[PDB]
Amino acid sequence: MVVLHSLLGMAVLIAIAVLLSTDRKAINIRTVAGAFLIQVALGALVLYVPQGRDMLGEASKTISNVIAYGNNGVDFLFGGLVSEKMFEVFGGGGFVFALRVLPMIVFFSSLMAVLYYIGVMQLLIKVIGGFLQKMLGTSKAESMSAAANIFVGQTEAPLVVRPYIRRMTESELFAVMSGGLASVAGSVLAGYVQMGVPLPYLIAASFMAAPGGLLFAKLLVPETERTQNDAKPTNVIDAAASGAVTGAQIAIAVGASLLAFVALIAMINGIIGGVGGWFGHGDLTLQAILGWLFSPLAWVIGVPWSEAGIAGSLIGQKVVINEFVAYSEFVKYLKPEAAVQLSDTTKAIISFALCGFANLGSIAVLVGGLSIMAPKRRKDVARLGIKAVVAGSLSNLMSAVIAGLFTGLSGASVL
Amino acid sequence: PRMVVLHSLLGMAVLIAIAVLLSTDRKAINIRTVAGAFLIQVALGALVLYVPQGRDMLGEASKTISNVIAYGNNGVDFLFGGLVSEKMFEVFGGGGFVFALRVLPMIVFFSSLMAVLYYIGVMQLLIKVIGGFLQKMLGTSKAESMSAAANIFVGQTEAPLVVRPYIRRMTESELFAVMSGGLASVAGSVLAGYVQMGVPLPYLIAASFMAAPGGLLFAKLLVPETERTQNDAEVLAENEDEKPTNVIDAAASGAVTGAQIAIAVGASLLAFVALIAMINGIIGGVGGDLTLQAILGWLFSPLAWVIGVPWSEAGIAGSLIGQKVVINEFVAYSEFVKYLKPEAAVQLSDTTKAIISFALCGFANLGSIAVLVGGLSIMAPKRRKDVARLGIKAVVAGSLSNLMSAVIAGLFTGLSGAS
Amino acid sequence: RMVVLHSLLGMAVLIAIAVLLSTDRKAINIRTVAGAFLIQVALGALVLYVPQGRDMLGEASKTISNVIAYGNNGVDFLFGGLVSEKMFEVFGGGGFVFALRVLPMIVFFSSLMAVLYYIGVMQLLIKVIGGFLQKMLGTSKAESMSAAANIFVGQTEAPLVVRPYIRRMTESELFAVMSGGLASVAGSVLAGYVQMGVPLPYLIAASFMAAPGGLLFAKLLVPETERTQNDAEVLKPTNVIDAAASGAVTGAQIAIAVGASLLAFVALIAMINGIIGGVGDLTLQAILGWLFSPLAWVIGVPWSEAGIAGSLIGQKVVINEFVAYSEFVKYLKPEAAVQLSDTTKAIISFALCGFANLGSIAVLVGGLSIMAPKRRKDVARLGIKAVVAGSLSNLMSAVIAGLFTG
């Protein structure tokens, strides 16, 4: 039974979290059982029942329209280098990453800046964040962080509650970090889409990341102390421009990091290839090692053993490098001309498991940005780095288990 | 048939009227200043378009800068290789023109070029000459004269740098004159950008020079000088800061600055064009063929007709002028150059194309307010609240200035020039 | 066929020029300068003459060439098919897009060196080579570490290892740091020259000879007249991924600044050539070639090719090495009209391998001041003299090259 394989996976994830908990006898049951109940509720809502799949389908239509609007600005700026004739000439190379993926960071950063300026995002965060604190009993600040994290990046997310950060507790801070590592940004989300990644999965994952982030944040470090209970751009054109420039230099940083990471990985594979020549192989790669290593974890979360090696590589690459490298090697399996055709339930698991910033490199990003908001807490942030990555990774896997289960029930994923 | 003078003088009268009606103190208006500015602007406008000797000078200047832009393209050809080559059109067609590779690098080169010209001492002299001419004829203060004269060549934030010890304690009318002169003007860097997009270069040069008196015109009309202009002896100019080591440093530094500027503009344009199409999606979804371009056009259609555009082509000019004010000139020009193509479905009259060219030539938009507020505060932090207050008024001042030159354009492009 | 006299002639002239421009010729440490000259010509004879050394140099060339290939994988990922071979089937000569072929190498090698700094490899290489230079030349530990570091990294990143010692270091030590930076390259832009076409083994050798050559003319122009510090230490990113990412971002904005500088410089040069060609075929290239022709002849270039080498070296000093190399690789094509000898191609490749130009003065002033702001006045004052020192160093390695080729 699929439900047995999924419930087992959920059991493993929750068990590992408790074993890594700082105070196991201090764990708030109402919070974590409520959080787990919400994440699986949203899971059943968007992936199982027809009404929710239609609502999710309408959302995909809307945001894709927005992405298309962004591409109008991309077509204007980069002319025919993003035209259709690129494939007619360069074939697969017709898809230029730096011109089709990175500019979406620029557009959405400006769009989010406009939405913040109008007052739309404050409303959405206040509503969703309010629902969380009312159900889970978490504080207001860490709750608002999760809602922001659904839409914006891990660094931009706590900005809405940034004066509360310098005084907030150990658990509240970790919850902000975990909620940050569990969720992507809307900017890079459209980036994944332009690479070929299924949009509806990314939407659902972004919403599930908020309670899932809180789930493993209250499991690893439950609230042991007292909380703190309480309660600019010139014009709209300035906000749009300010967001564009911000998203521009972010995109340059992202594009430069990927160019370096990919090249370094190939360099490592060259080293492992030579040294591994005496090990009886020589054709060994880092991808295979990660896949062979993370193979058990892939099988636990619902992936068949035949594809557990593949899923292991993608999950492995995600944590040690980033999600972009993972998704870049993942879309290669989504091609209809692929030698190895993945199952539908597998693709859903991976799509949810990979949707997160939880990696070794995001730690320094957290440290830098979260310190600018709270400099005296900088030592605390860097200390909770690894544990937060774990919390974020477990949140992604929880969403993956839930996803693979509901696709095993009534399946759906267009090629 | 020579009724154009009536239609033009009407437009001139309307533009000056709107200014006077929006003035802070109508009885404080210095007639010798505003009549001088209007007379100078129409004199320059006539001279370069009308008389043969003036057309030759504008043509000589055009050929000079055209060669400069060509020199810049050598660097572009070097850096981006064949992505800016001729066979880009043989392959991609119209899409062979890559805006990021054809336009933005010109911002880099000219920013480095102007850095060299400021280093040799050339630009300080030109500003000192033209600025001195404006304080003699218009009676405006020394500071606002240098700023207005500077704005002809450089940007709105870079221009007041030559008078930055004056900015701290200058009056509102002077402060408003600096802001207006910056909004009614362009930058030589982005000017070369418009040229590559297809915009007529001679019109740009003419509009750039008319920006200074036209700026001071509506600056002294909206906010006249009711206080004392500072004298040199009373001002102590706080020291120094960086001066570039040598000419190679100056060129390299200016290039890097122009590079990050080109990045900021490029990203802003990607966002703006996208957000515009997103608004068209919202409107088109709520309303069907209704777009923001059409609304802005239908809205500014009368104002387009006032300045001398035929009603058949008034809707188009309305969209372009509209898009300029609410977004920027790059978006306006990008839509304008499509009407300049020989195989274009919609064909405009020669006089209309000129009117639009001059009307669009200016930084007068809602975004430039925040640009001024930022850069002008770095020079004088105590005046930041005052700058932000006069933001909208100054944009209007810049708009009226650009429109005034456009009226003059249509009037003297009302014959056989066609430069 | 004994150009050994012509080479020794070149060495003599260069050293003589250095001595004449010195502050205190009576304070020159002979053991230091003769040692530095001895080491530089020893390295030359090792990697360019004797078989066992050419092999090691060839192996290092092969290794780094593989590293470069690994970097291109990341480049192929980012910029897709605009770096494919189809570009040549379409655009031909223009298929080679500089901004896409060369600049991203700076990003990759700035991240890689950041990793090597993180692992602890570079700290070891600096400590070993630096200790070798303080023992043989008698130079202070700090200025030896900086010179050794300048082999791998840039002029502003090299003194970062001896950063706390810069505030209290002497006039001669400071100049030696500046000279070491101007006489040397970075591994980032080194891979950039390789992608243009410039022979990798020459770039390898030149980068290693840069350190003792820099120390040579630094202790010649301003010898140590004060008391120094004896012992010195080499001496943060959260993890290796942070270091690799940070190095990439730094290299990115660096690549932006470099590319923009080239676009301007190239365009400004074409503008000057347009001014000169006015009525009221002479170019800035030819003029600089006409001026630096004698100095090109002294270092061992045949007079028939002295005009060409003069332009290239001339452009290097007044503009930069990228502009110089970009017009030098045109002579390395088999389809070129003017062919050059193998010895000349080696001479120019070594002479142009350095940041020593008029524009690098401001770069030194900027970065070296961030490390020691009270010494900013001293750095700017010694700017031109340091450019001379770096230039003479590159010329020395060029003489050594032309000598040991054959």
Ligand SMILES: O=c1ccn([C@@H]2O[C@H](CO)[C@@H](O)[C@H]2O)c(=O)[nH]1
């Ligand atoms: O808005 C963003 C986008 C990216 N990143 C960082 O960049 C990596 C690649 O997108 C992510 O994993 C994350 O560490 C952020 O912190 N915020």
Ligand SMILES: O=c1ccn([C@@H]2O[C@H](CO)[C@@H](O)[C@H]2O)c(=O)[nH]1
């Ligand atoms: O040198 C420049 C170029 C552009 N801009 C700003 O960027 C907008 C688009 O060019 C202009 O309207 C102006 O606000 C400047 O301020 N200075």
Ligand SMILES: O=c1ccn([C@@H]2O[C@H](CO)[C@@H](O)[C@H]2O)c(=O)[nH]1
């Ligand atoms: O790592 C580097 C690379 C370049 N440059 C500066 O940039 C110029 C062009 O590469 C060089 O001459 C030098 O002045 C540095 O300072 N450090």
Ligand code: NA
């Ligand atoms: Na997020």
Ligand code: NA
């Ligand atoms: Na201006």
Ligand code: NA
């Ligand atoms: Na160096």
